Amino acid sequence: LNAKVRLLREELQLLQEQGSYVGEVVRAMDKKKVLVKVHPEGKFVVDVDKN
């Protein structure tokens, strides 16, 4: 039962968290920075995370 409840709570938290855009990598310019174009709006240089 505890596993069931924990799974449901994690699912609730993640769903209540918003979504995420999808982008195509134009070029991996510089370390920790990635130039990515996201449809439809302009192309941004993103500060890539650690993972």
């Binding site: 039962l1 069931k4 409840v5 799974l7 449901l8 709570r9 699912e11 609730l12 993640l14 769903l15 209540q16 968290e17 918003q18 979504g19 995420s20 855009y21 999808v22 449809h39 439809p40």
Partner: protein
């Protein structure tokens, strides 16, 4: 306490949802969708949506703000 959890699930699976197209299954309980608003998102699949019935380029309904494939 396990009750109220099914309740919150059925409540997040509400009426004013937005239709979209499920493009690909990136991984378990997560996938890429394209909202009919005209933009693509990488959202989280709710549980119990018959992954077998969730075929590529299918018509899905997403939470209006979380865009989750409810």
């Amino acid at each position: 306490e396990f009750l109220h959890a099914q309740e919150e699930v059925k409540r997040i699976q509400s009426i004013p949802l937005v239709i979209g197209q499920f493009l690909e299954a990136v991984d378990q309980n997560t996938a890429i969708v394209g909202s009919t608003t005209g933009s693509n998102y990488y959202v989280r699949i709710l549980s119990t949506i018959d992954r077998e019935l969730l075929k590529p380029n299918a018509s899905v309904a997403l939470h209006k703000h979380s865009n989750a494939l409810v």
